[PDB]
JSON list of C-alpha atoms and ligand atoms in Angstrom, two decimals:
[
{"chain": "A", "resi": 1, "resn": "UNK", "atom": "CA", "xyz": [93.36, 164.04, 112.07]},
{"chain": "A", "resi": 2, "resn": "UNK", "atom": "CA", "xyz": [94.85, 163.90, 108.74]},
{"chain": "A", "resi": 3, "resn": "UNK", "atom": "CA", "xyz": [96.90, 166.17, 106.78]},
{"chain": "A", "resi": 4, "resn": "UNK", "atom": "CA", "xyz": [95.94, 166.95, 103.17]},
{"chain": "A", "resi": 5, "resn": "UNK", "atom": "CA", "xyz": [98.94, 167.05, 100.83]},
{"chain": "A", "resi": 6, "resn": "UNK", "atom": "CA", "xyz": [98.55, 168.13, 97.19]},
{"chain": "A", "resi": 7, "resn": "UNK", "atom": "CA", "xyz": [100.31, 166.71, 94.16]},
{"chain": "A", "resi": 8, "resn": "UNK", "atom": "CA", "xyz": [99.82, 167.20, 90.43]},
{"chain": "A", "resi": 9, "resn": "UNK", "atom": "CA", "xyz": [100.92, 165.81, 87.09]},
{"chain": "A", "resi": 10, "resn": "UNK", "atom": "CA", "xyz": [96.39, 167.99, 84.63]},
{"chain": "A", "resi": 11, "resn": "UNK", "atom": "CA", "xyz": [94.65, 166.56, 87.75]},
{"chain": "A", "resi": 12, "resn": "UNK", "atom": "CA", "xyz": [95.31, 167.78, 91.29]},
{"chain": "A", "resi": 13, "resn": "UNK", "atom": "CA", "xyz": [95.47, 164.92, 93.80]},
{"chain": "A", "resi": 14, "resn": "UNK", "atom": "CA", "xyz": [95.04, 165.64, 97.49]},
{"chain": "A", "resi": 15, "resn": "UNK", "atom": "CA", "xyz": [96.29, 162.69, 99.52]},
{"chain": "A", "resi": 16, "resn": "UNK", "atom": "CA", "xyz": [94.74, 162.41, 102.99]},
{"chain": "A", "resi": 17, "resn": "UNK", "atom": "CA", "xyz": [97.51, 161.27, 105.32]},
{"chain": "B", "resi": 1, "resn": "UNK", "atom": "CA", "xyz": [102.77, 186.05, 103.76]},
{"chain": "B", "resi": 2, "resn": "UNK", "atom": "CA", "xyz": [101.16, 183.08, 105.16]},
{"chain": "B", "resi": 3, "resn": "UNK", "atom": "CA", "xyz": [101.26, 179.53, 104.37]},
{"chain": "B", "resi": 4, "resn": "UNK", "atom": "CA", "xyz": [98.00, 177.59, 104.00]},
{"chain": "B", "resi": 5, "resn": "UNK", "atom": "CA", "xyz": [98.14, 174.14, 105.60]},
{"chain": "B", "resi": 6, "resn": "UNK", "atom": "CA", "xyz": [95.26, 171.68, 105.21]},
{"chain": "B", "resi": 7, "resn": "UNK", "atom": "CA", "xyz": [93.89, 169.28, 107.80]},
{"chain": "B", "resi": 8, "resn": "UNK", "atom": "CA", "xyz": [90.81, 167.08, 107.90]},
{"chain": "B", "resi": 9, "resn": "UNK", "atom": "CA", "xyz": [88.79, 164.91, 110.25]},
{"chain": "B", "resi": 10, "resn": "UNK", "atom": "CA", "xyz": [84.30, 165.39, 106.94]},
{"chain": "B", "resi": 11, "resn": "UNK", "atom": "CA", "xyz": [85.40, 169.08, 106.88]},
{"chain": "B", "resi": 12, "resn": "UNK", "atom": "CA", "xyz": [88.66, 170.30, 105.37]},
{"chain": "B", "resi": 13, "resn": "UNK", "atom": "CA", "xyz": [90.32, 173.00, 107.48]},
{"chain": "B", "resi": 14, "resn": "UNK", "atom": "CA", "xyz": [92.94, 175.25, 105.92]},
{"chain": "B", "resi": 15, "resn": "UNK", "atom": "CA", "xyz": [94.92, 176.98, 108.66]},
{"chain": "B", "resi": 16, "resn": "UNK", "atom": "CA", "xyz": [96.53, 180.25, 107.59]},
{"chain": "B", "resi": 17, "resn": "UNK", "atom": "CA", "xyz": [99.93, 180.38, 109.28]},
{"chain": "C", "resi": 1, "resn": "UNK", "atom": "CA", "xyz": [82.04, 161.27, 95.88]},
{"chain": "C", "resi": 2, "resn": "UNK", "atom": "CA", "xyz": [81.19, 164.54, 97.25]},
{"chain": "C", "resi": 3, "resn": "UNK", "atom": "CA", "xyz": [81.60, 167.91, 95.94]},
{"chain": "C", "resi": 4, "resn": "UNK", "atom": "CA", "xyz": [84.18, 169.96, 97.86]},
{"chain": "C", "resi": 5, "resn": "UNK", "atom": "CA", "xyz": [83.11, 173.56, 98.49]},
{"chain": "C", "resi": 6, "resn": "UNK", "atom": "CA", "xyz": [85.55, 176.14, 99.93]},
{"chain": "C", "resi": 7, "resn": "UNK", "atom": "CA", "xyz": [84.93, 179.20, 102.08]},
{"chain": "C", "resi": 8, "resn": "UNK", "atom": "CA", "xyz": [87.30, 181.62, 103.82]},
{"chain": "C", "resi": 9, "resn": "UNK", "atom": "CA", "xyz": [87.42, 184.20, 106.60]},
{"chain": "C", "resi": 10, "resn": "UNK", "atom": "CA", "xyz": [91.89, 183.50, 109.20]},
{"chain": "C", "resi": 11, "resn": "UNK", "atom": "CA", "xyz": [91.05, 179.93, 108.02]},
{"chain": "C", "resi": 12, "resn": "UNK", "atom": "CA", "xyz": [89.80, 178.14, 104.92]},
{"chain": "C", "resi": 13, "resn": "UNK", "atom": "CA", "xyz": [86.87, 175.76, 105.37]},
{"chain": "C", "resi": 14, "resn": "UNK", "atom": "CA", "xyz": [86.21, 173.07, 102.77]},
{"chain": "C", "resi": 15, "resn": "UNK", "atom": "CA", "xyz": [82.93, 171.18, 103.07]},
{"chain": "C", "resi": 16, "resn": "UNK", "atom": "CA", "xyz": [81.99, 167.94, 101.32]},
{"chain": "C", "resi": 17, "resn": "UNK", "atom": "CA", "xyz": [78.56, 168.13, 99.69]},
{"chain": "D", "resi": 1, "resn": "UNK", "atom": "CA", "xyz": [105.14, 165.13, 89.67]},
{"chain": "D", "resi": 2, "resn": "UNK", "atom": "CA", "xyz": [104.81, 168.34, 91.38]},
{"chain": "D", "resi": 3, "resn": "UNK", "atom": "CA", "xyz": [103.84, 169.34, 94.74]},
{"chain": "D", "resi": 4, "resn": "UNK", "atom": "CA", "xyz": [101.24, 172.10, 95.20]},
{"chain": "D", "resi": 5, "resn": "UNK", "atom": "CA", "xyz": [102.13, 174.50, 98.01]},
{"chain": "D", "resi": 6, "resn": "UNK", "atom": "CA", "xyz": [99.69, 177.23, 99.10]},
{"chain": "D", "resi": 7, "resn": "UNK", "atom": "CA", "xyz": [100.50, 180.77, 100.17]},
{"chain": "D", "resi": 8, "resn": "UNK", "atom": "CA", "xyz": [98.34, 183.81, 100.85]},
{"chain": "D", "resi": 9, "resn": "UNK", "atom": "CA", "xyz": [98.58, 187.53, 101.48]},
{"chain": "D", "resi": 10, "resn": "UNK", "atom": "CA", "xyz": [93.26, 188.21, 99.88]},
{"chain": "D", "resi": 11, "resn": "UNK", "atom": "CA", "xyz": [94.36, 185.84, 97.05]},
{"chain": "D", "resi": 12, "resn": "UNK", "atom": "CA", "xyz": [95.44, 182.24, 97.59]},
{"chain": "D", "resi": 13, "resn": "UNK", "atom": "CA", "xyz": [98.44, 181.28, 95.45]},
{"chain": "D", "resi": 14, "resn": "UNK", "atom": "CA", "xyz": [99.20, 177.61, 94.84]},
{"chain": "D", "resi": 15, "resn": "UNK", "atom": "CA", "xyz": [102.75, 177.25, 93.56]},
{"chain": "D", "resi": 16, "resn": "UNK", "atom": "CA", "xyz": [103.37, 174.10, 91.52]},
{"chain": "D", "resi": 17, "resn": "UNK", "atom": "CA", "xyz": [106.83, 172.87, 92.46]},
{"chain": "E", "resi": 1, "resn": "UNK", "atom": "CA", "xyz": [82.89, 184.65, 104.82]},
{"chain": "E", "resi": 2, "resn": "UNK", "atom": "CA", "xyz": [83.79, 184.63, 101.29]},
{"chain": "E", "resi": 3, "resn": "UNK", "atom": "CA", "xyz": [83.47, 182.07, 98.72]},
{"chain": "E", "resi": 4, "resn": "UNK", "atom": "CA", "xyz": [86.82, 180.67, 97.56]},
{"chain": "E", "resi": 5, "resn": "UNK", "atom": "CA", "xyz": [87.07, 180.18, 93.79]},
{"chain": "E", "resi": 6, "resn": "UNK", "atom": "CA", "xyz": [90.04, 178.35, 92.21]},
{"chain": "E", "resi": 7, "resn": "UNK", "atom": "CA", "xyz": [91.66, 178.74, 88.80]},
{"chain": "E", "resi": 8, "resn": "UNK", "atom": "CA", "xyz": [94.79, 177.21, 87.27]},
{"chain": "E", "resi": 9, "resn": "UNK", "atom": "CA", "xyz": [97.30, 177.71, 84.47]},
{"chain": "E", "resi": 10, "resn": "UNK", "atom": "CA", "xyz": [102.04, 176.71, 86.41]},
{"chain": "E", "resi": 11, "resn": "UNK", "atom": "CA", "xyz": [100.17, 178.09, 89.47]},
{"chain": "E", "resi": 12, "resn": "UNK", "atom": "CA", "xyz": [96.79, 177.77, 91.17]},
{"chain": "E", "resi": 13, "resn": "UNK", "atom": "CA", "xyz": [94.97, 181.02, 92.00]},
{"chain": "E", "resi": 14, "resn": "UNK", "atom": "CA", "xyz": [92.24, 181.02, 94.64]},
{"chain": "E", "resi": 15, "resn": "UNK", "atom": "CA", "xyz": [90.15, 184.17, 94.92]},
{"chain": "E", "resi": 16, "resn": "UNK", "atom": "CA", "xyz": [87.82, 185.12, 97.78]},
{"chain": "E", "resi": 17, "resn": "UNK", "atom": "CA", "xyz": [84.42, 186.27, 96.53]},
{"chain": "F", "resi": 1, "resn": "UNK", "atom": "CA", "xyz": [93.11, 179.37, 82.57]},
{"chain": "F", "resi": 2, "resn": "UNK", "atom": "CA", "xyz": [90.99, 176.61, 83.66]},
{"chain": "F", "resi": 3, "resn": "UNK", "atom": "CA", "xyz": [88.52, 176.36, 86.32]},
{"chain": "F", "resi": 4, "resn": "UNK", "atom": "CA", "xyz": [89.60, 174.07, 89.16]},
{"chain": "F", "resi": 5, "resn": "UNK", "atom": "CA", "xyz": [86.83, 171.79, 90.45]},
{"chain": "F", "resi": 6, "resn": "UNK", "atom": "CA", "xyz": [87.30, 169.68, 93.62]},
{"chain": "F", "resi": 7, "resn": "UNK", "atom": "CA", "xyz": [85.78, 166.35, 94.61]},
{"chain": "F", "resi": 8, "resn": "UNK", "atom": "CA", "xyz": [86.43, 164.03, 97.56]},
{"chain": "F", "resi": 9, "resn": "UNK", "atom": "CA", "xyz": [85.96, 160.44, 98.69]},
{"chain": "F", "resi": 10, "resn": "UNK", "atom": "CA", "xyz": [90.32, 158.98, 101.14]},
{"chain": "F", "resi": 11, "resn": "UNK", "atom": "CA", "xyz": [91.64, 161.49, 98.53]},
{"chain": "F", "resi": 12, "resn": "UNK", "atom": "CA", "xyz": [90.73, 164.88, 97.09]},
{"chain": "F", "resi": 13, "resn": "UNK", "atom": "CA", "xyz": [90.61, 165.16, 93.30]},
{"chain": "F", "resi": 14, "resn": "UNK", "atom": "CA", "xyz": [90.88, 168.58, 91.65]},
{"chain": "F", "resi": 15, "resn": "UNK", "atom": "CA", "xyz": [90.15, 168.73, 87.93]},
{"chain": "F", "resi": 16, "resn": "UNK", "atom": "CA", "xyz": [90.95, 171.60, 85.57]},
{"chain": "F", "resi": 17, "resn": "UNK", "atom": "CA", "xyz": [87.98, 172.54, 83.40]},
{"chain": "G", "resi": 1, "resn": "LIG", "atom": "CL1", "xyz": [102.82, 164.36, 107.70]},
{"chain": "G", "resi": 2, "resn": "LIG", "atom": "CL1", "xyz": [105.51, 177.03, 108.22]},
{"chain": "G", "resi": 3, "resn": "LIG", "atom": "CL1", "xyz": [109.17, 170.05, 97.93]}
]
């Protein structure tokens, strides 16, 4: 499983950890 | 209120806590 | 890539077309 | 950068911190 | 289910059609 | 507002039309 964390600076980036 | 947490393994699952 | 499509009903379900 | 946190009570609200 | 539709302007707003 | 459109491939990419 991975957790999806969202960041932004505009484009939203969801990193799959 | 509930927080939406996202997990993945593909389908993304957003658990409403 | 795949298109990400979201549904809801609780828990959110995102599917990757 | 900002982190996107999701809350719900229905409308989903993504706060950009 | 409902379709989840996202908008942005900051804060993201997801609405459940 | 802008419409938020999501794609995936890993990392999710949300773009603001
Ligand atoms: Cl973690
Ligand atoms: Cl919590
Ligand atoms: Cl934080």
